[PDB]
Amino acid sequence: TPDSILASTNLRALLNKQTFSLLPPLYQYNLIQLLPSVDRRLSASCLNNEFFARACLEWRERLSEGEFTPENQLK
Amino acid sequence: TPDSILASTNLRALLNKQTFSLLPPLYQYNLIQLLPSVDRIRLSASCLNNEFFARACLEWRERLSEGEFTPENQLK
């Protein structure tokens, strides 16, 4: 929920290959379609990165600091 | 000087290659005769810049200051 709700979680550990392996294949495929060009089994470092962790942190911050609720349809 | 005449000098600097070059040849040769087997008229300047030469001069002033090696030293 992008309305500053439960943004205080440790997403870097929440989003792991185990929580990823808890998804159906026809959803994991759609997921890796949004992954970098390391698309092609999973290369465990794919979800343990400096840029991925800083990404998740700039995400939860990007939600708490300023809400990106449906107000966010500015262009 | 057996015990105490001008023993308070900084001999390590007093005895330099220049004061050696201030001596007649027929005395400088006599000097190098008292040098180690590195004898073989020039002077290899490091010959007088050594840890062991300085320690020699210092154990020398000690041998003069701490206990005189005057003819008293015939305890043997």
Add this chain to the structure above:
Amino acid sequence: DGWLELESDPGLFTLLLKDFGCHDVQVEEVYDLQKPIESPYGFIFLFRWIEERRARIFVKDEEAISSIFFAQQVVPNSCATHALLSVLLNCNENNLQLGDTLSRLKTHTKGMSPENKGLAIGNTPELACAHNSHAMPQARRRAFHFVSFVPINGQLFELDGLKPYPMNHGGWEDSEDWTDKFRRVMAEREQDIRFNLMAVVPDRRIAITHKLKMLRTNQAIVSGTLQKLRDLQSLLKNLDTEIAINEQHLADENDRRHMFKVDASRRTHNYDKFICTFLSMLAHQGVLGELVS
């Protein structure tokens, strides 16, 4: 003008120079100057300041000589590209083959004024697309002062892109190479600063493969002579061990290049579209994330 901020990372710069057409070039990070490196094309120096406190020697060159590539940085966020071009464009074409999109610039700006030579840097599009192609997605905007050390002819020129004049150090002794003079100017400094220093050398693999040729020829010269009925097997043994050593070295180099390629392919990606769809797929079934701080 307006360019994109970049992460200071030797892999990013190596892939940048590859994206500039200059292939036979490389930037390794130096941790101590004492360990020597073969044929360094030129060094790059980086300051930082955490608590600002700053708001960023008269040995400048006064004569209006723009024969060397010096350009005042007018394009913001172009620090890194300006420094790299400053260390490359003042070297010998004999020693290195620079990319045609680089040599076109170096020969285009013969004797140009720096205040618009840096503008010539800013105007080249195939350079701005390559430099901007490596910015992190958090460059959604709408530190790291670079100083380049390169000699032209026995004179170690400290090129500062922000200062108006290039600083020369003029070190020449026929007993020492210029890398010996570079360390003497490294009288740095020490409080809380996150400085960093890199070295621009040529691609190590080009010096390696040549050694694999000059070695494998002797590997190929195995003169087994028969008198129809001296023994230097240990020689082929030792040089074969050398061949294996340089093989593992080269493999380590290509592995470093692949690693930089991975870090670059992840640094560029914008994960937002990935995270949302991810979370909604968990909150569809596995709503309960009990990893709250």
Add this chain to the structure above:
Amino acid sequence: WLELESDPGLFTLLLKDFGCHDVQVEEVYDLQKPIESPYGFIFLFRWIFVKAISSIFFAQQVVPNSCATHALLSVLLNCNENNLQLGDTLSRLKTHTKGMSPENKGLAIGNTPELACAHNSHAMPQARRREAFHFVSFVPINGQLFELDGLKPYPMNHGGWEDSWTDKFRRVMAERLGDIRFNLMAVVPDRRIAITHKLKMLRTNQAIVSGTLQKLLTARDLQSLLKNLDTEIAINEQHLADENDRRHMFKVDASRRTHNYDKFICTFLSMLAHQGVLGELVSQ
């Protein structure tokens, strides 16, 4: 016995005066930098539980100030005579102590005259006998590094290896103290023979100049090959020259360390007082 200066050159010239030709003692500055075939290490302090059969040389040091000789003999006499040629007067001792008790093997060390004359032959005139540099010797027999301490009654073992012993020596540097000016040296074989061997194995390729001519009715312009490898030959040449020059340096420092300068000083000063040229500038 007499105290000696702790200096790798002094020990090199000691072993050279012991007949051990293919030997040298260099000081190690970092454990990471590898050295080829170290015969054994020596450990030195300046400010201060493992295991019968004592067939190996662990002679208890009974003679004071014999620390250096004890460490060197401790690292050498537990190596292969096949690998290195020790002086006949040394190997005679090594075979003279077959299974002897250590507590009196050091007395056999004390009785050897060519050991007191050669070891005492390098003492400074300041050897007037009337916390310290304790020596600890590391030598392997078969994959097991025995820490030999001449003052402790038993030798300490540290373990084996994994074939993936010099690597095992660094594993023993997990020691914390707490203040100490310790120092560590390494006993290697004479570098110059391993240099000359490379000068042969190089100068054969220098000699293999296959000049083939395509001017009459892989092989290409390879002048740069003989050029670069020739530069390598010159590099190893300068290495060897530097080594023999180091030997000359040790010979000079040894010829000055032994000399007693007092008789020289007296004559010098008296020769100044002969023409009254005193030191009326330097004082205190």
